[PDB]
Amino acid sequence: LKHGTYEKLDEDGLIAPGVRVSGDDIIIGKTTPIPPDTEELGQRTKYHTKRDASTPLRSTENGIVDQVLLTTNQEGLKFVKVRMRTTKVPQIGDKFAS
Amino acid sequence: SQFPYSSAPLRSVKEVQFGLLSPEEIRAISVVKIEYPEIMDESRQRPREGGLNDPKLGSIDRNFKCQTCGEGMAECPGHFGHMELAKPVFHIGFIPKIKKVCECICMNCGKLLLDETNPTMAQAIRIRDPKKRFNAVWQLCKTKMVCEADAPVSRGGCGNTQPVVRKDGMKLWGTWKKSRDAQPERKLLTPGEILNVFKHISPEDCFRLGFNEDYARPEWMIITVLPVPPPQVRPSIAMDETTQGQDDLTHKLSDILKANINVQKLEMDGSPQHIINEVEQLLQFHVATYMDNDIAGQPQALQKSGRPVKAIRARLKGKEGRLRGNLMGKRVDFSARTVISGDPNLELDQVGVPISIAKTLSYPETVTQYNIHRLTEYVRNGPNEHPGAKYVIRDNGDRIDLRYHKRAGDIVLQYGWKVERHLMDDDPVLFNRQPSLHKMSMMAHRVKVMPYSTFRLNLSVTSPYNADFDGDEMNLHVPQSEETRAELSQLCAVPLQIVSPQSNKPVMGIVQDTLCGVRKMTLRDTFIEYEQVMNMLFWVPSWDGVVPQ
Amino acid sequence: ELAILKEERTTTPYLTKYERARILGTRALQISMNAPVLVDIEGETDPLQIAMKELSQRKIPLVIRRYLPDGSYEDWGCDELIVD
Amino acid sequence: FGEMERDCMIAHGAAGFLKERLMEASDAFRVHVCGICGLMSVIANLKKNQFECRSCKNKTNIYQLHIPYAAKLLFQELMAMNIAPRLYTERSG
Amino acid sequence: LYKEILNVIAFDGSYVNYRHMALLVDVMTSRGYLMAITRHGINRADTGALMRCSFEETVEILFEAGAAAELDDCRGVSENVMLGQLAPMGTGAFDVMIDEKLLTS
Amino acid sequence: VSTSTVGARRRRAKQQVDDEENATLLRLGPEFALKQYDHDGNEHDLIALSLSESRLLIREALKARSRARNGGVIDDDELAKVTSGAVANGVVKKTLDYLNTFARFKDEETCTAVDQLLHNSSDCSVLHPFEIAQLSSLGCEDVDEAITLIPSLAAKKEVNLQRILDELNRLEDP
Amino acid sequence: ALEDIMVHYDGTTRNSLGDIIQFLYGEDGLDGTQVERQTIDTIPGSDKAFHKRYYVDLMDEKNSIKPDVIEYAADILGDVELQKELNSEYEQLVSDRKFLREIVFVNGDHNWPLPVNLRRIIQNAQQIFHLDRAKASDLTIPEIIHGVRDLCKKLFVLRGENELIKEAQQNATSLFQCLVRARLATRRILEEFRLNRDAFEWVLGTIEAQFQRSLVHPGEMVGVIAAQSIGEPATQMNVTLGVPRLKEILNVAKNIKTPALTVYLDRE
Amino acid sequence: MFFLKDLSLILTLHPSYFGPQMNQYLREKLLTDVEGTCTGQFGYIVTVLDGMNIDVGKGRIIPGSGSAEFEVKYRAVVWKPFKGEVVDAIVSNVSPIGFFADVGPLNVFVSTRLIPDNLVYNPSNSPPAYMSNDELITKGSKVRLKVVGTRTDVNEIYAIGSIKEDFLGAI
RNA sequence: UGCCUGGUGUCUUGGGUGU
Ligand SMILES: [Mg+2]
Ligand SMILES: [Zn+2]
Ligand SMILES: [Zn+2]
Ligand SMILES: [Zn+2]
């Protein structure tokens, strides 16, 4: 798993709009199946069958989740888009021009 | 101290001796023989032994140890394997030299066409440099077009007429003037014939030709056994979460091995010469393009995607090649980059560093009895509070991360440990702007930690850097040792660079509005009242506390 | 054989800036590795400052070996090289 | 830390800083070389404390070096092309 | 050669110290003939193969060195840079020994 | 760990048969060749040591070190205990026990006379030092026995082997 | 091309092969940062001005040192040995003038970069020792002559007693010795600068120390410095000129764009 | 067989020992690290001659690590067995697979296949021995054996002896 | 007593920033 936090995800693996996010947080939760190992020996169903393929927020960016879009691609599979919003106030080093 | 202990003595390279690899040495240094073209055993992990991904060649997986040395991925250097060629092939990089050597010697008796009896030949042999010696010997013996079975007394020759050799791609044509005009025959000079001719060259003749008996023997220019590089040289890449991609070298080696298998199968079963020629020429092409894919005069080897194959030669040349892009200049750790800004209130040799950059970068300070108290305070403060620390390094080399330690207050520092403390004030750091046209483009400043996210410079140093504050960015490099810190503070420091050796004149002066204001302020009709004079005098750091009359 | 006798030493009798920088760095590193200090320390704590104080008093126990182009060398003590 | 920065560091005369930048702050690596053949073919097993060069059949005349990983890669790629760069820790004249 | 170089540099009023141009024109004419500052001039010296291959014609130089069994003495600065060693320059142009005589105090 | 004064020995192509260790063939390898070099690089001969000479040298060196460590103020057990290192102590104990239980000559003058006889002799001027050490060590009694034990002396028939053996037996303390 | 060139401990400038490029860096062994434009005073001016400035006559009263500047003006006139010393000094000055005017600088340019600024040293001495006031100096002429003569032999660029080493050492400081003798002449010291004794030894010691400090340091990578110093102006810049001409020069092109000759005709 | 050899050692010293007693400390460190060691190339180093007057020279400071490196040259007594050499021994153990003897610091194992057949191993004897009608070799018995093979280990040497030829066996 | 995770493609191309 990614070192970020998964606690902001909903039941369907998608974050909800209006939630403040920080760098490395997980905004899309996705897993890919993996052939199980011999852990079925004595593991009480607690054996790894899936591998994480989640999408984390960029490390240097943070903001508010603005709008989450869920639809189907041309192939009929699920397809999501997450838009993040933040405000940038001028500060020392910002470039201006006439 | 970052490497696990090894009892072998540690020394430094003093000489690099070049040469060719004999087939005996290739077989000796190898650890496995590569013969099966299939990369994967049954697509069920555990790559096939004897294949291109044999576990004995080395390990590139974290949980898999090398079966040859037993070391981990971080320590295994990779081990070579060898592939036996069914028929010898030319080395693509030595074909012109092979042609020259064929012109210099007789193709039957394997002896030089000229002897020391000729004064010019003896003069040429007298020279020392192997390349110039070979050039002179070739210039002389080129003219001699017939072997002499008798002295020009027997000189050891066979008396046969020497053919004229012409190059055509990877094939060499030898034309004999068989016996005014008659019918001459030009026949192909196969690599095997040239190889067995070269093996009969005497060591003295080999030395006369510029080759070295011990290190560069002429017949080693024909490839009879191929070394297979370890997977470290040709790592695989995971294109997506499921399918990984074989490297270009791996595919080329698979093609070469398939061609070798095809030649071996064809030879034992049935031998139409046309088919043999076609298949052996295919093998020669594959071996040649595996090492050089820019051979002028013939089409390049292409991938299934249509892109040309990245041969080994292409890996070493250009700006992005090995030498220019990874050895002469490489990406480095402990560095920062951000926009620069001006600060009139900074000394000449001071740079303003943001707090976040100061927290990210670090300097390993050895714990002694002069600073153990301060370093313990830094360790307590942790990696988020300035001044703080990021790691504690023990004598054995183990790193203690202070982010993930629940008992940071329960750490006692012993003498000789290192604390990777945060960047602090008056730390010398190297500061740089590209392009670095002259040596004043890299100078060492003293750190001053400041808020906001830009590097800050006294405006007098904007001239040597050729920098202004309209968006320029500059690079900062942190020394990581006492020796390096001393070198920076004693050699590259900004005050030492004021006068340049290019024109023996200063490179830094008063600039911009300070220059305008020192012209306006020093006019003859500028008078200043007492209350403003007091403020102006207090602003001078070096003022001695006496107001002038 | 390769060593040059003290009477026939012909190199400069001054500490060049490269030699000064290298000597200061090496001495600072050694002090940071708990080497004995040959001068009294008033209130100084920085290894580089202690090394500079040692150098000013000609107390650094190091020897410079200057390599001539032919391979011969001259051994100069840091206590007999003039420092500016 | 490109070539022009390397030239500036040469002009300053700071050899230690250049070595540290290109080794410690970058790809530093440790290899073992045979004292006879001069090749990086020593099969070193640090935990068992045994070193061995099969080609020369020796167990003693073996040294270790600290070289950039890119240099090791370059020498291995040269060996892949039948060129043998031999590293020796003593001069001969 | 010095006169021509100085004429080129000083046309726009710029000034470069004499010793630099003197060094350049002494390098260009040190072999008895004019040595152009190109691969055909620099790479035709007796310097180490590793130093020469770092400029231009890397692979061809490496093959020529291998076939001729060239020996590189690792005296240059490029050789020591690409091997991660202390170059024999600046602060690396000497050795520091330990003074067992002075430590007796 | 320790390195001999002989260095270089780089790669070549020829292989020789005089490389393998063999006492009978008197092939002792490069590091034990007949010609050696000292710290000054001058010519030096291989220095073999018989059990008498080895015992004399080890006893002298050990007692000198013991005297030095006590400020310059005989028992083999105490002498072994002088050295440092438990494994070193055991090794020197074993060597001392071997030398004592097989010492043919425990006197300095007897060993000196034996060495003079085995060196200054005209016949022995060609004898290899290893052969001399073996002769003084094994304490052979017969020409046939010595030849069987030392195959090298079989090819050297210009040696007064029997009378030299009798001289050694005489010098040997009964 | 120039990377592997470095000043060695014997003063020579060699590449990595050990081949000599120069027998002395910059032909004087100095560092590029430790030189300044100075005027050599023996070059310019007519013969009458040179004679008036430098000649001292102890027989003619009105052509001698002024009596108010020296305490010992009474027992100077009529001395013959001191006149011999002064004549030797003046002959040395005339030889320097001839050497500079006929060999080194034929066009008469006298403003050249030279080490240790003499004017700054002299005015520092004047400020330090309060050399104002009409007070008479106590500096005897033989002290001046011998002090300057000895100073011109302590400017060590090369150490050693070898004869060839001594010849190279003498060659390396010819121009600087000419400058020093031009400035520290007897008449100029006694009249123009009015130094006393203590100022004189201070000036001599300062000149020697500064010259020792202005030498080049073994271990300089002068090749890279030269390459950078030549390439830096090129980034900021009928015959061909500019970058194309520099490219023609460096490549040693056989057929340049505008070949030309400069034919000089005979005097008539 | 014992020999005199001129050996050299590389000694690295930590800066914390840079004191007036540096030379003597290097001497004892050399003695502790050389006396009694076993190198396959040379054999066994038993003693170092002139152990208190060994020249150490001038140590070189390792760039970047501060520690000084010393090159110490010394003369030492070395013992090394050779293939095909006959030497005296003392039996240390008796076992059905063969008997183990000691030649100084070296322990030599002789298998039954290299022992004359008449010397049948007697386990009933006290102590058990390989005995014949006129020969009886047990623990502590002097034996003359010929070394046939030597095995090289990390810091150990294993030799194999034989008594199957003439003038061998019990002495 | 229920007990805590560091591991990140490659190759092309295109548009830009500062000289
Ligand atoms: Mg700008
Ligand atoms: Zn491995
Ligand atoms: Zn012929
Ligand atoms: Zn080897």
Automatic annotation (TrEMBL), chain A:
Function: DNA-dependent RNA polymerase catalyzes the transcription of DNA into RNA using the four ribonucleoside triphosphates as substrates.
UniProt similarity note: Belongs to the RNA polymerase beta chain family.
Stated name of the protein: DNA-directed RNA polymerase subunit beta
Subunit structure: Component of the RNA polymerase II (Pol II) complex consisting of 12 subunits.
Subcellular location as annotated: Nucleus
Biological source species: Komagataella phaffii (strain GS115 / ATCC 20864) (Yeast)
Automatic annotation (TrEMBL), chain F:
GO molecular function terms noted in the UniProt entry: DNA-directed RNA polymerase activity; nucleotide binding; RNA-directed RNA polymerase activity; single-stranded DNA binding; single-stranded RNA binding; translation initiation factor binding
Ranges where the RNA polymerase Rpb4/RPC9 core domain occurs: 40-174
Pfam family, one: RNA_pol_Rpb4
GO biological process terms on file: nuclear-transcribed mRNA catabolic process, deadenylation-dependent decay; positive regulation of translational initiation; transcription elongation by RNA polymerase II; transcription initiation at RNA polymerase II promoter
Coiled coil: none
GO cellular component, one term: RNA polymerase II, core complex
Keywords tagged on the record: Nucleus
Record localization: Nucleus
Region annotation Disordered: where it falls in the sequence: 1-18
Family to which the UniProt record says this protein belongs: Belongs to the eukaryotic RPB4 RNA polymerase subunit family.
Protein name in UniProt: RNA polymerase II subunit B32
UniProtKB/TrEMBL annotation, chain G:
Cellular localization per UniProt: Nucleus
Superkingdom of this protein's organism: Eukaryota
Family recorded in the similarity comment: Belongs to the RNA polymerase beta' chain family.
Role played: DNA-dependent RNA polymerase catalyzes the transcription of DNA into RNA using the four ribonucleoside triphosphates as substrates.
The name this protein goes by in its record: DNA-directed RNA polymerase subunit
Included stretch of the parent chain: 845 to 1125 of 1743
From TrEMBL, chain H:
An MF annotation (GO) of this entry: single-stranded RNA binding
Cell location: Nucleus
Source organism, top-level taxon: Eukaryota
UniProt xrefs under Pfam families: S1, SHS2_Rpb7-N
SUPFAM superfamilies: N-terminal, heterodimerisation domain of RBP7 (RpoE), Nucleic acid-binding proteins
GO terms, biological process: nuclear-transcribed mRNA catabolic process; positive regulation of nuclear-transcribed mRNA poly(A) tail shortening; positive regulation of translational initiation; regulation of septum digestion after cytokinesis; transcription elongation by RNA polymerase II; transcription initiation at RNA polymerase II promoter
Domain S1 motif: 84-164
Gene3D superfamilies assigned: Nucleic acid-binding proteins, RNA polymerase Rpb7-like, N-terminal domain
Keyword line: DNA-directed RNA polymerase, Nucleus, Transcription
Broad class of where this protein is predominantly found: nucleus
This protein's GO CC annotations: P-body; RNA polymerase II, core complex; RPB4-RPB7 complex
Chain's role: DNA-dependent RNA polymerase which catalyzes the transcription of DNA into RNA using the four ribonucleoside triphosphates as substrates.
Protein family per UniProt: Belongs to the eukaryotic RPB7/RPC8 RNA polymerase subunit family.
Name used for this protein in its record: DNA-directed RNA polymerase subunit
